[PDB]
Design a protein around this ligand. Structure first.
Ligand code: 1N7
Ligand code: MG
Ligand code: MG
Ligand code: MG
Lengths: 52, 94, 177, 1114, 315
DNA sequence: GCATCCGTGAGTCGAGGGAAGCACAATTTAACACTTTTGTCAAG
DNA sequence: CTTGACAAAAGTGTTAAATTGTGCTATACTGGGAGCCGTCACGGATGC
């Protein structure tokens, strides 16, 4: 059940694009936005704000 | 159950690695006509036929028994595939 | 074991002038009890030639040497006027139940194999009573009751069973080790 | 073997003809015997009087009468030549030229009407078929509550199926009553005005309820003339068409006033008059007369709706599942409906032909084209859902199939779109539809069976009989009555005690509107005829039904249909009393027409001399193959010179013993576990059953081959097949067909056929082979018919139909057809399915020798061993009581008739068991035998279990055990007794049609699909096993990646992969690595056909060609 | 379960003595039964444990073979150096497990000797064997258990008769009490102290309470008077059946629901052994059809959910 | 807040299921004497 | 290993015959017809 719920909670929604090309309200995967955020922090850019 | 199945499962970190090793050893045994076996003549698997006892034709049984004996080395990046096949052909012509 | 009826190719057919079909006639024949008076006799063929109108029974078979029909009153078929029954019944000697699909005996082209139940013994029971002898009261009284079709008497069947058990007990004599 | 009858309920009336629902309905539909001038306006006569006269409007085609001729061929000839048993239908028609006033009359051949056989079935294309009756919502006027909004009601006017649109009347929140037709809502005010209704009329009639009439007083259109109101309504119903008076009046008249397009039906009209308290002149919502529309039902419907909304005491909502609101379309009504559709198409053709051509020089024969009528009729009798392949495994199977009622079919519900409500057992099913008999699964509740005493009336409503009760005495007056009429009376139960005819019990269990109540004898108005009327024919054949759970009684009744006839079939020891009636009404057995003497008895015919002196010869159906392959033969049961009375049995039909239904064998059953061979419903049987040919059936298989015309030459059915030895052709006769009586095994030739080979040069290796052996390639190849794997038997019949034979309508290009009937005698074997009437079923898992089976102390072995653990979970205790009564009868040499819910009770069974023990132990005592030592041990154990009373003698304890149905049973393997007494009795067990012989199938390689190249499916096609999605999921969960890849590629559709794998295996090598499946290539090509660029890439995103360069343009 | 369940007697059941010789002598006189719980001097024992003291399982099973004692008789056995007081059936089960696993000590540590072997105990034994030994020995133990269970269920004498569905004497009294309470409720309703809905609820509660009491009475009768009853043994061991089905066979069928969902005021007071009436059978048909339709329409929903779950977590 | 539109609804198995002419121009096919090549048989 | 014919199976032109494709017919004719509720129920998404 936890595996299935983990699949259920796999996605997030953008609230503030920050210094990225994403759109506010866009739905993507949590891993993708986390990787994008860490990359943006790597070169000193505004992180993407997301919502579970 | 297969004989010594618990020991076979305990000899590897993942059961699918055990299956891969057994299948690859069985294919090696089939390709060279069981002449590359590490089993002594008293250890070769046998089947009862109307004529009499003969060598077991099932290579998976031979591979499992060989893996039980512990004279086989299994792992990743041991030897190059081409070199391994060439040396196995040279030592065991077929 | 086998039956051949003239002008009949298989058992799934009906004979003109005969009330019963060949399946029913074969079923009736399966209840025929034949006793061989010669121990060396292994196979007999009984010929039956009947013309209607009559009730052809087991007593209408032609007499054969060293062969007896233990149930002459067994009903075989009912022949209507204008009907004829010419048939040959091959009776073999054997042991156990051999289906017609196993032996497959056909004396001729149109012979019909018949499932053969060679066992003459119809029923066996045995009864144990609390007999007493002397001062001990735990003894057993054994009573074997044997019902047989009549071809083999119950005493003969008991003797054969005892001999078979003795022969099988002799198999424990020579150890192969 | 005497029969002892139990029960106290005296049935006043016998069971009605069980097939009357088919026979009477079709007789009414056809009316072939009543003279034309006395024919009533029903059935195809009604269809003729409805579609005719045909007027172009001065050509008028009037219908005067019709007649049905004798069938061209008899039923046997139709079956043998694959024909349809039908009668020619001619119509007498006159063409009137209104201009000249001249009439020309001639008889036109309208076609062929399929005929119903005496048993109630049809022969369509040589195959027996049954038209299953369809239950549906009766037409009429209904008033249902609105679910979205409480306190509101909606009125539905429903015509006959495909005979007009449903009419919805709903009081909207605004207050305007809205009429919904054809998904379109409009104000009912407009149509009500179109029907010549003014404001004062509405205020006077519907104005006595409240504001509801005020919602129907819109004066914006009341003053508007009826003509413009009609045009406005026409604009509402179909917007866009140019508003014209003629078109609009035609459309409205067709929608609500045309008898030829709107038909409320006789049942619908009757229900409308009964509910609304009015009298319809016709069967239409309105009448069109004097150039104006007159209302028939809209005002009464709206008045009832308004009064119901107001809350008058006398008006109530309608339960749409109430069986008084649900009606039955039998074979007659369905055939009449399809005949009317075909007649309407024919009328269209006749109208279009009289428009053209010389109106002066026209005859009724030229105008009438009967092809559409024949097309509609053949479509109904062949490709209809309700026209089902007849189920004739045994006579009970056909009897059930003729009494089945299906909610599905054209005009009914859908298997998946049907909810729980339509599938539930309504309270009105009591006595009309069997509650327990229904196919479990997707069709539960959708298909049911007519009750035993139930009959469908003229209008299609199922009626059940009740005995009139007046003043406390139950009279012999029986009233057949419907559910809506049944709801008005207090109906007692058939088991109510009676002192003669007076009701003796002070408290009577009764039903009031389906609810159980306790009433006084003076409050009872009707009584049930018998407990049998509640259940169908199949369920009435289950003794001790009151001790079986309904879920298992369902299974037992369903499996009674699947039992195969046996060569030694015998009627059950415990019967219910319907076996004789089932055999008699199935028309499988033969009975004497009147008193007489039998003149000739033969396996093929019975010739009887009746009292009047006429010789009557009845041929006997011998070894006939049913639709399911079972052998249906009649065996004579009389002798020459025997005196027979009227109705006396002459010959048993299939599955009948002396006129009693015999679906199986009566076997000695011990209820006890046995070495795990009884595990999970498995059954253990003795070899003695096979020795004396019990559960042995005869099955006939039909193999068909055709010799055809081909461009290369004609296929020849000949014995000279190229490249075959004499051993293969040994059993073939000179004509190339297998000789009758030959024993054929799988791979043996039935009919030898050679076909011309396609012109194609051989492969060079074949050419070199032929040159080496010096053998010239022949022009023909073996295409002969051989026995499929797992089949065979004895060739019992050969039928050869040739082109030009009388009545043989072969398809074009087919020179001849040969059919081989091969009969095999199947004995009971491991994997065969046995069952009993109480829902206990299982496959034979072990066949023991006689010396291994448990045996009685007298030496009698048991025949079947059943696992007791199947009893507690299933709660079918009727099998236990049947076993006890069977033990009693077995030792008493008698059979029993115990009717369901009124029959043998436990005290009676125990007294019978006391008599049985008396004989069974008196035999032992007279023979000079006491009590066994091992019997004493079992008695000691039993008194430790409290089964027998301590302190009694061993004989008395054995008697107690026998009265409990248990005996001291011995183990044939050890000779020691079973430690506890075992329930041993005689039980009736049926051998079902499901046999492992017809179900075992295996395949290595075989045919493949055309597109996907995957293996076909089905044992008949030698197909593979479907490895669906869930199996793939199981392999993925196991982690068997390579097994999954093999099943997906190497064994299904990798053409190169499968070829290489087979070649490697036959060479003793390991199968190669698989490749891309052909299904993926098909997927890619289809996606490309959808203009989608699907490209397979590599690690470096470069395209990878999976088509081997065969689709790349250079 | 049949071999590992012990016998209980009632003949003696309580007499006290001074010396074991007096208890024995009372046993040969027929005053006390073999398995009846008695007190010798201060301790509570049985005649079986004193009369039959076996030096090893071999002697106990030899005595069983000679008919001296049964597998269910509680006797004293010297096993693994301990003077156990168990039945030869339980000692036999211990030997079965020991020979299946080829280790006496581990098998002794794996089993619960002092209880009959129901489904749960056997499942725990299989799990512990899997933990301690592996797949091979667990499969061997499973095969041994299968063999011995089949053999003993065959030779034991389990059968289903009409009298095996014992009707408790308490059912008639409970039905009379329910009828009297129903008459009292009807009188109260005629007096107007309660409305239709609460009267219907009280009727339902009364009939549910009566059904529960009848179930308890059925199972109490089984566990007191017929501990080896086939229905009771099958239910207790977990082989087949549940208390509801045993009640329907032995007690009363109970309340049934209308097709709309409402329960009929009158229950089905007759069981399957007594036989339902036509009206009661028709009433039960509603629930049977409802259950069948529910099962028919539940498979599609379950399969569709399973496919959704597969396709969301397949990766 | 509701209205409308759309896609979804277990698996395996079997069993039978299976307005029309009429004239005329092109075009294709069949057939038919003739030249071939293609096998053979004869000796050198 | 070669010519030196030669029966024959194959290939090659025209032709008469079926076979197939196309045009044309002159009283006047000028907007279809099968539809038809146990409308399947219920979430998800769009969009007014
Ligand atoms: C302990 C005894 C030998 C010990 C010794 O050698 N000394 C072994 C050797 C052979 C074993 C039987 C057979 O396997 C058949 C069968 C297998 C089932 O699984 C369990 C029951 C059976 C009867 C076994 C019981 C027991 O386990 C035996 C007698
Ligand atoms: Mg015999
Ligand atoms: Mg079904
Ligand atoms: Mg002692």
């Amino acid at each position: 059940i936890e595996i299935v719920v983990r699949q259920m909670m796999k996605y997030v929604e953008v609230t503030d694009p920050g210094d990225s090309r994403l759109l506010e309200g866009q739905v993507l995967e949590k891993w993708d936005v986390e990787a994008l955020n860490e990359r943006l922090i790597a070169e000193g850019k505004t992180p993407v704000a997301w919502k579970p | 159950a297969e004989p010594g199945i618990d020991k076979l499962f305990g000899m590897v970190d993942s059961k699918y690695r055990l299956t891969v090793v057994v299948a690859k050893r069985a294919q090696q045994l089939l390709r060279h006509g069981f002449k590359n076996t590490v089993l002594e003549p008293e250890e070769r698997p046998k089947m009862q036929t109307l004529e009499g006892l003969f060598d077991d034709p099932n290579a998976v049984t031979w591979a499992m028994k060989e893996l039980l004996t512990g004279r086989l080395v299994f792992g990743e990046n041991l030897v190059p595939e081409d070199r391994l096949q060439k040396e196995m052909e040279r030592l065991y012509p077929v | 074991t086998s039956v051949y009826i003239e002008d009949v190719l298989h058992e799934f057919s009906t004979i003109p002038g005969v009330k019963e079909d060949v399946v029913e006639i074969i079923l009736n024949l399966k209840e025929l009890v034949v006793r061989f008076l010669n121990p060396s006799l292994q196979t007999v063929t009984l010929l039956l030639k009947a013309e209607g109108p009559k009730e052809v029974k087991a007593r209408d078979f032609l007499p054969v040497a060293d062969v007896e029909i233990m149930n002459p009153d067994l009903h075989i078929a009912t022949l209507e006027e204008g009907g004829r029954l010419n048939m040959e019944v091959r009776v073999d000697r054997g042991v156990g139940y051999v289906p017609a699909e196993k032996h497959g005996i056909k004396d001729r082209i149109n012979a019909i194999p018949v499932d053969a139940v060679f066992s003459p013994v119809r029923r066996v029971a045995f009864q144990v009573e609390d007999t007493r002898l002397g001062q001990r009261t735990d003894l057993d009284k054994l009573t074997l009751r044997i019902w047989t079709d009549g071809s083999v008497t119950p005493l003969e069947a008991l003797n054969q069973a005892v001999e078979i058990l003795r022969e099988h007990l002799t198999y424990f004599s020579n150890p192969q080790a | 073997m005497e029969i002892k009858r139990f029960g106290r309920i005296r049935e006043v009336i016998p069971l009605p003809p069980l097939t009357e629902i088919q026979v009477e309905s079709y007789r009414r539909a056809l009316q072939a015997d009543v003279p034309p001038e006395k024919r009533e306006n029903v059935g195809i006569q009604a269809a003729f009087r409805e579609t005719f006269p045909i007027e172009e409007e001065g050509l008028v085609l009037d219908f005067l009468e019709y007649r049905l001729g004798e069938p061209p061929f008899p039923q046997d000839e139709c079956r043998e030549k694959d024909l349809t048993y039908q009668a020619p239908l001619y119509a007498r028609l006159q063409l009137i030229h209104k201009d000249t006033g001249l009439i020309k009359e001639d008889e036109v051949f309208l076609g062929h009407i399929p005929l119903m056989t005496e048993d109630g079935s049809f022969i369509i294309n040589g195959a027996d078929r049954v038209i299953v009756s369809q239950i549906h919502r009766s037409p009429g006027v209904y008033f249902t509550p609105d679910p979205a909004r409480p306190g509101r009601y909606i009125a539905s006017i429903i015509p006959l199926p495909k005979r007009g649109p449903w009419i919805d009347l709903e009081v909207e929140p605004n207050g305007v009553v809205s009429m919904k037709v054809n998904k379109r809502k409009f104000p009912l005010v407009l149509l009500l005005r179109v029907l010549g209704y003014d404001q004062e009329t509405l205020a006077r009639e519907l104005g006595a309820y409240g504001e509801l009439v005020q919602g129907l007083m819109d004066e914006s259109v009341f003053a508007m003339r009826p003509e413009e109101a009609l045009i406005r309504l026409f604009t509402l119903l179909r917007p866009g068409d140019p508003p014209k008076r003629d078109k609009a009046v035609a459309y409205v008249y067709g929608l609500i006033a045309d008898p030829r397009r709107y038909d409320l039906g006789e049942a619908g009209r009757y229900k409308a008059e009964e509910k609304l308290g009015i009298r319809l002149s016709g069967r239409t919502l309105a009448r069109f007369e004097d150039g104006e529309f007159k209302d028939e039902v809209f005002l009464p419907t709206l008045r009832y709706l308004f009064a119901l909304t107001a809350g008058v005491p006398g008006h109530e909502v309608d339960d749409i599942d109430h069986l008084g609101n649900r009606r039955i379309r039998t074979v007659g009504e369905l055939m009449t409906d399809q005949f009317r559709v075909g007649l309407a198409r024919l009328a269209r053709g006749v109208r279009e032909r009289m428009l053209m051509g010389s109106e002066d020089s026209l005859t009724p024969a030229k105008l009438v084209n009967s092809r559409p009528l024949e097309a509609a009729i053949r479509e109904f009798f062949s490709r209809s859902q309700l026209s089902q392949f007849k189920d004739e495994t045994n006579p009970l199977s056909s009897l059930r199939h003729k009494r089945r009622i299906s909610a599905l079919g054209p005009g009914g519900l859908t298997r998946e779109r049907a909810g729980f409500d339509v599938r539930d057992v309504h309270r009105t099913h009591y006595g009309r539809i069997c509650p327990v008999e229904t196919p479990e699964g997707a069709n539960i509740g959708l298909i049911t069976s007519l009750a035993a005493y139930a009959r469908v009336d003229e209008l299609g409503f199922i009626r059940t009989p009740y005995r009139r009760v007046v003043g406390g005495v139950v009279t012999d007056e029986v009233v057949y009555m419907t559910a809506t009429e049944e709801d008005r009376y207090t109906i007692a139960q058939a088991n109510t005690p009676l002192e003669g005819n007076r009701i003796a019990a002070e408290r009577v269990v009764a039903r009031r509107k389906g609810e159980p109540v306790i009433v006084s004898p003076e409050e009872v108005e009707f009584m049930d005829v018998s407990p049998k009327q509640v259940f169908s024919v199949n369920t009435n054949l289950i003794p001790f039904l009151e001790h079986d759970d309904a879920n298992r009684a369902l299974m037992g009744s369903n499996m009674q249909t699947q039992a195969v006839p046996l060569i030694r079939a015998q009627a059950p020891v415990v019967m219910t009393g319907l076996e004789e009636r089932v055999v008699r009404d199935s028309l499988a057995a033969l009975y004497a027409e009147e008193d007489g003497e039998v003149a000739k008895v033969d396996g093929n015919r019975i010739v009887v001399r009746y009292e009047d002196g006429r010789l009557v010869e009845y041929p006997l159906r011998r070894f006939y193959r049913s639709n399911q392959g079972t052998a249906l033969d009649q065996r004579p049961r009389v002798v020459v010179g025997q005196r027979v009375r009227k109705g006396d049995l002459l010959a048993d039909g299939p599955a009948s013993e002396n006129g009693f239904l015999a679906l199986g064998q009566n076997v000695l059953v011990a209820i006890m576990p046995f070495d795990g061979y009884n595990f999970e419903d498995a059954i253990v049987i003795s070899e003695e059953l096979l020795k004396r040919d019990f559960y042995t059936s005869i099955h006939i298989e039909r193999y068909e081959i055709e010799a055809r015309d081909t461009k290369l030459g004609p296929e020849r059915i000949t014995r000279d097949i190229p490249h075959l030895s004499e051993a293969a052709l040994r059993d073939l006769d000179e004509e190339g067909v297998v000789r009758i009586g030959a024993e054929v095994k799988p791979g043996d030739i039935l009919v030898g056929r050679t076909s011309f080979k396609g012109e194609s040069e051989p492969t060079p290796e074949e050419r070199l082979l032929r040159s080496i052996f010096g053998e010239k390639a022949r022009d023909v190849k073996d295409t002969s018919l051989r026995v499929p794997p797992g089949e065979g038997g004895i060739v019992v019949r050969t039928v050869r139909l040739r082109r030009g034979d009388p009545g043989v309508e072969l398809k074009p290009g087919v020179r001849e057809v040969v059919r081989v009937y091969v009969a095999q005698k199947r004995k009971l074997q491991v994997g065969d399915k046995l069952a009993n009437r109480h829902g206990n079923k299982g496959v034979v898992a072990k066949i023991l020798p006689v010396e291994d089976m448990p045996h009685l102390p007298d030496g009698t072995p048991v025949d079947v061993i059943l696992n007791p653990l199947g009893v507690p979970s299933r709660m079918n205790l009727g099998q236990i009581l049947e076993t006890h009564l069977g033990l009693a009868g077995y030792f008493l040499g008698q059979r029993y008739i115990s009717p369901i819910f009124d029959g043998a009770k436990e005290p009676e069974i125990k007294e019978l068991l006391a008599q049985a023990f008396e004989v069974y132990f008196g035999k032992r005592k007279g023979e000079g035998f006491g009590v066994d030592k091992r019997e004493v041990e079992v008695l000691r154990r039993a008194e430790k279990l409290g089964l027998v009373t301590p302190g009694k003698t061993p004989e008395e304890q054995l008697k107690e055990l026998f009265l409990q149905g248990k005996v001291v049973l011995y183990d044939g393997r050890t000779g020691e007794p079973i430690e506890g007494p075992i329930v041993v009795g005689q039980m009736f067990i049926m051998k079902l049609y499901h046999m492992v012989e017809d179900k075992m199938h295996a395949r290595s390689t075989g045919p493949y699909s055309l597109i996907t190249q995957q293996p076909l499916g089905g044992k008949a096609q030698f197909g593979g096993q479907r490895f669906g999605e869930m199996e793939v999921w199981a392999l993925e969960a196991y982690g068997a990646a390579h097994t999954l890849q093999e099943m997906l590629t190497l064994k299904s559709d990798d053409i190169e992969g499968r070829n290489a794998a087979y070649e490697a295996i036959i060479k003793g090598e390991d199968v190669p690595e698989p490749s891309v499946p052909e299904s993926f290539r098909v997927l890619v090509k289809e996606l490309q056909a959808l203009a989608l660029d699907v490209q397979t890439l590599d690690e470096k995103d470069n395209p990878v060609d999976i088509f081997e360069g065969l689709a790349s343009k250079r | 379960y049949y071999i590992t369940q012990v016998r209980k007697e009632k003949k003696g059941a309580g007499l006290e003595f001074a010396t074991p010789e007096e208890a024995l002598a009372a046993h040969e006189r027929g005053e006390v039964a073999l398995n009846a719980p008695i007190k010798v001097a201060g301790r509570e024992t049985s005649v079986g444990r004193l009369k039959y003291v076996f030096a090893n399982p071999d002697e106990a099973l030899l005595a069983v073979a000679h008919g001296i004692v049964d597998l269910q008789d509680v006797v004293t056995v010297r096993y693994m150096g301990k003077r156990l007081e168990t039945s030869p059936g339980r000692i036999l089960f211990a030997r079965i497990v020991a020979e299946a696993v080829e280790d006496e000590k581990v098998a002794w540590e794996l089993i619960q000797l002092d209880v009959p072997q129901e489904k749960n105990s056997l499942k725990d034994l299989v799990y512990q064997a899997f933990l301690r030994l592996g797949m091979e020995k667990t499969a061997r133990l499973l095969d041994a258990l299968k063999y011995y269970g089949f053999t003993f269920s065959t030779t034991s004498g389990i059968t289903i008769g009409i009298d095996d569905a014992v009707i408790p004497e308490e059912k008639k009294q409970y039905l009379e009490e329910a009828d009297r309470k129903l008459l009292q409720i009807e009188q109260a309703y005629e007096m107007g102290f309660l409305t239709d809905r609460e009267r219907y609820d009280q009727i339902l509660q009364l009939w549910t309470e009566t059904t529960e009491k009848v179930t308890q009475a059925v199972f109490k009768n089984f566990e007191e008077n017929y501990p080896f009853n086939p229905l009771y043994v099958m239910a207790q061991s977990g082989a087949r059946g549940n208390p509801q089905q045993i009640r329907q066979l032995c007690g009363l069928r109970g309340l049934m629901q209308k097709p709309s969902g409402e329960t009929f005021e009158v229950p089905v007071r007759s069981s399957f052994r007594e036989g339902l009436t036509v009206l009661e059978y028709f009433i039960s048909s509603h629930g049977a059809r409802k259950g069948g339709a529910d099962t028919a329409l539940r498979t599609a929903d379950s399969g569709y959910l399973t496919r959704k779950l597969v396709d969301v977590t397949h990766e």
